[PDB]
Structure formats: C-alpha cells, structure tokens
Design a protein around this ligand. Structure first.
Ligand code: HEM
Length: 148
C-alpha cells in the first residue's frame, strides 16, 4: 500500500543511528516496565539499575539485534509471512528468558515512543497506526513461541 511507505519512510530516519535510537527504546522500556531489567543476565549478574544496562556491551548488542529484526520487518513490510517462522522461534527464545507475554505491548509502546521522538511532527497518526500494525504483526508471530 502507501502505509508500507509510511513505515519505510519513518524507518529511514531511525536506521541512520540504530543503537542510538534503540538506546531510546530500551530506556523508555525500563522506565515503563522496570521488572524487565533482570531478564538480561550476562555472566549471571543482574543489572541493578537501568543505567547499568547501558554500560553492558552485551546489552548494547541486544539493542543492535532488536533493531535488525525490526529492520527485517520493515524490509518485508509487504509480506511478513516470509519472516513468521524466524519470529516464531525468536518468541520461543524470549519465552525461555522469562519474558511475559504482556511485556510485548510495552516493547511496542517503547518503539513507538522512540519513533515519535525521532520523527516529531513527521510522526503522523497514519504513521502511529502503520507501525502499530507492523509491530502488532511481529508480536503475533513472536507469540506463537508460547503456542497454546
Ligand atoms: C524488550 C524486551 C526484551 C528482553 C527483556 C529481551 C531479552 C533478551 C535476552 C536475555 C536475550 C538473550 C541474550 C542476548 O542474545 O543478548 C535475547 C536474545 C535476542 N533478542 Fe531479545 N529481549 C527483548 C526483546 C526483543 C525484541 C522485541 C526483539 C526483536 C524484535 C529481540 C531480539 C532478540 C534477538 C534477535 C536475540 C538473539 C536471539 C537468538 O538466539 O537468535 N529481543 N533477548
């Protein structure tokens, strides 16, 4: 559609600087859901405060991964069936880390925030709506790693 392009166009801006943008996504996410923070367990140490996470290179790496999955979702915005099977298994990985199912919606409100703050006025409600459809779909796929 033209929604696919709303997405492509918004993303444009964000993949200039994906860590920086994802840094935003995650800080927002911890602000909204602090109980997520212990789920990263690099060396079986638990970050004590959000800012600790920002000093973890493993964590920053997880940001890069997040943004690359999202990036794959944008590339395939036309048909997200092509990455259903990947995303399903990726949801399974997340099941295993202790991630609740409810927590996806936060991750999604985090991404939106991040887009909204990056695009300011360009972040029109058709844009909120498109991303939300995209991310909604990513989660649908991901949720099938809780299958039942
Ligand atoms: C936001 C809450 C999330 C938490 C708390 C979380 C946590 C984790 C943890 C602990 C791992 C394992 C360690 C690591 O690879 O660095 C992991 C792996 C991964 N996460 Fe997340 N994650 C979250 C969301 C996401 C989201 C939304 C995505 C993608 C859109 C994502 C993509 C990945 C990827 C790609 C891996 C590597 C998976 C593999 O083994 O293939 N994560 N995540």
């Amino acid at each position: 559609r033209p929604e696919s392009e709303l997405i492509r166009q918004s993303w444009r801006v964000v993949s200039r600087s994906p860590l920086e943008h994802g840094t935003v996504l995650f800080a927002r996410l911890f602000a909204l859901e602090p109980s997520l923070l212990p789920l990263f367990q690099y060396n079986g140490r638990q970050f004590s405060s959000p800012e600790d996470s920002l000093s973890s290179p493993e964590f920053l790496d997880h940001i890069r991964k997040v943004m690359l999955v999202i990036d794959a979702a944008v590339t395939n915005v036309e048909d997200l069936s092509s990455l259903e099977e990947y995303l399903t298994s990726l949801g399974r990985k997340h099941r295993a880390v202790g991630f609740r199912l409810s927590s996806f919606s936060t991750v999604g409100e985090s991404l939106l925030y991040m887009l909204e703050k990056s695009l300011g006025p360009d972040f029109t409600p058709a844009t909120r709506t498109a991303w939300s459809r995209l991310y909604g779909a990513v989660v649908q796929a991901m949720s099938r790693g809780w299958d039942g």
